[PDB]
Amino acid sequence: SGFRKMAFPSGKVEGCMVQVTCGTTTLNGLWLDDVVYCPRHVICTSEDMLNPNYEDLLIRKSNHNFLVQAGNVQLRVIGHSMQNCVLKLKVDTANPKTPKYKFVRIQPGQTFSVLACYNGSPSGVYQCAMRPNFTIKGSFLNGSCGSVGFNIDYDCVSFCYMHHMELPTGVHAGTDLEGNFYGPFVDRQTAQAAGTDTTITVNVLAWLYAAVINGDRWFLNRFTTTLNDFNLVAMKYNYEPLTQDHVDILGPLSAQTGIAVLDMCASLKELLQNGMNGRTILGSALLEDEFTPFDVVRQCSGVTFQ
Amino acid sequence: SGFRKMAFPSGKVEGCMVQVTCGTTTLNGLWLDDVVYCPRHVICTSEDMLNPNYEDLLIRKSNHNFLVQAGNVQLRVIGHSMQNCVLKLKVDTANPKTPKYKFVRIQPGQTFSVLACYNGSPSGVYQCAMRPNFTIKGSFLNGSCGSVGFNIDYDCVSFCYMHHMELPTGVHAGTDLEGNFYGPFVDRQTAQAAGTDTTITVNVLAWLYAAVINGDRWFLNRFTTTLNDFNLVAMKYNYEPLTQDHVDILGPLSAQTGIAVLDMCASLKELLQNGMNGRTILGSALLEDEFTPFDVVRQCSGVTFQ
């Protein structure tokens, strides 16, 4: 028993991180097969970032202006191309440590692990969720650009995030591995406001199921509700509305615990209206929304990977 | 910016996990050089665990009764010995993936990363603290015994924990890598009560410094205090007393932020007496005590490892 905010094991990704330098800018790259992926603003100076014209900046760069370093291994760049907001650097050596991998574009509410890196070297690993306003609440310092987010399915790594920017508000924005930003953000140092950061209701429900499985049952009440009545309350508290698709995804947790999804919704509804009154749930005094239903099943079942 | 409960990157440890089977019991082992370390209760059946006589059970085992499997690689056991509560199995092959490593026995309040494994395969990684009553609040299912806790110093892995037991209360107990339990626990299925789980005061203070560094300053008040006056209040709230050694360890955070340790203590004192009144600190509604002063410095400075 017990329940923890657990990250994926990072070994498969550690072997893919490299350092990319162009001029005086150094950040992280992802080395898979014979391609290195990195944020295109590696070609920018700090002054360029206020108003960069990436096509015009890229004209002044040749293959030999990109220095790619793996440990001390030095990779030769033999081709480069810009795909949306990422640079693809073709190198002369395929990564011998390339895992089975896939590129996926995730949806808000989904979770992944981030391997925070500096100068191509791993610093730590943590789990986070893509917020409904397409930011993540990360832990990133200067030099962390190019760090990646990922999930694992048995032996296959799914890369879903590459870090590009810290907004003036202190939250983080980035792209998928095809270079497309999540959300409306651009790789320019300018005021960009995120929308409302709503709570991911289906994840809260999954975590309440985890609590019940682990013996925290005090919040279970005597009421039930309907989807429309719950959603009326949720939207007042900046909670995401629940759909029938979400009820379906929660089915296996309802079956294991014997608590119907709508009964759990009525328990949540009373928690939103009355608060937790100084009590905790799974060691937290707030409702946690960074566990998906799949995360809960995985952790409570002991799924392993290659 | 931002602040996360960050684990160490796990790749160096992943390459050391193996599966150990004896009879019908299977758990995890740690393969370093030509030795495999695992919990000695691998030699027990579920019935033996109520009252095991390990010396007498061990008499009935030979080298060939231990099956050690690394992926599909099958290791030959050529010697075995019991050291306190761990079995050391000598195998015929040195682990080619052995990192630079050390065995350390940690003190309560120190933090480490746990690589939770099942059947020798990694399931996830998370950060936790050794509680002052020598338990950890883990996430472990049946089969997780032999999973290890570790820290990293540049290129050296410090192994500090091996998981052995879940207490009837749902908290977790285990040994250092020399087989000595943390705390008064024994590897027998019997009622064992832990002592009071007090809050690790020096860690709370470190995390409040992290909050200030990251812009959460609302709790800073106008008061100061003394060590004796603070400790009088702390002990009433089941907080660990603060010593001069703890003040010294916090010196670099006080220097960076300009806030004296005793001033931060007065801020904490008012938080204990008045609560947080529905506000949060670094996204938490409780005072967090699983970051050491070194963790905070490391995360706020971007330290990396091999």
From Swiss-Prot, chains A, B:
Localization annotation: Host cytoplasm; Host Golgi apparatus; Host nucleus
Cytoplasmic topological domain residue ranges: 1-306
Cross-linked residues, Glycyl lysine isopeptide (Lys-Gly) (interchain with G-Cter in ubiquitin): K5, K90
Peptidase C30 domain segment(s): 1-306
Active-site residues per Swiss-Prot or TrEMBL entry: H41, C145
Reactions that this protein is recorded to catalyse: TSAVLQ-|-SGFRK-NH2 and SGVTFQ-|-GKFKK the two peptides corresponding to the two self-cleavage sites of the SARS 3C-like proteinase are the two most reactive peptide substrates. The enzyme exhibits a strong preference for substrates containing Gln at P1 position and Leu at P2 position
Reported regulation of activity: Inhibited by pyridone-containing alpha-ketoamides compounds 13a and 13b. In turn, alpha-ketoamide 13b (tert-butyl (1-((S)-1-(((S)-4-(benzylamino)-3,4-dioxo-1-((S)-2-oxopyrrolidin-3-yl)butan-2-yl)amino)-3-cyclopropyl-1-oxopropan-2-yl)-2-oxo-1,2-dihydropyridin-3-yl)carbamate) inhibits SARS-CoV-2 replication in human lung cells. Inhibited ex vivo by michael acceptor inhibitor N3. Inhibited ex vivo by compound 11a and 11b.
Effect of C145A: Complete loss of 3C-like proteinase nsp5 cleavage
Effect caused by changing P132H: In strain: Omicron/BA.1, Omicron/BA.2, Omicron/BA.2.12.1, Omicron/BA.2.75, Omicron/BA.4, Omicron/BA.5, Omicron/BQ.1.1, Omicron/XBB.1.5, Omicron/EG.5.1
Primary role: Cleaves the C-terminus of replicase polyprotein at 11 sites. Recognizes substrates containing the core sequence [ILMVF]-Q-|-[SGACN]. Cleaves and inactivates human TRMT1, preventing tRNA guanine(26)-dimethylation of tRNAs. May cleave human NLRP1 in lung epithelial cells, thereby activating the NLRP1 inflammasome pathway. May cleave human GSDMD, triggering alternative GSDME-mediated epithelial cell death upon activation of the NLRP1 inflammasome, which may enhance the release interleukins 1B, 6, 16 and 18. Also able to bind an ADP-ribose-1''-phosphate (ADRP).
Description of how the protein assembles with itself and partners: 3CL-PRO exists as monomer and homodimer. Only the homodimer shows catalytic activity. Interacts with host FBXO22; this interaction promotes the proteasomal degradation of nsp5.
Protein name: 3C-like proteinase nsp5
Organism, as annotated: Severe acute respiratory syndrome coronavirus 2
Gene name tied to this protein: rep
Residues of the full protein shown: 3264 to 3569 of 7096
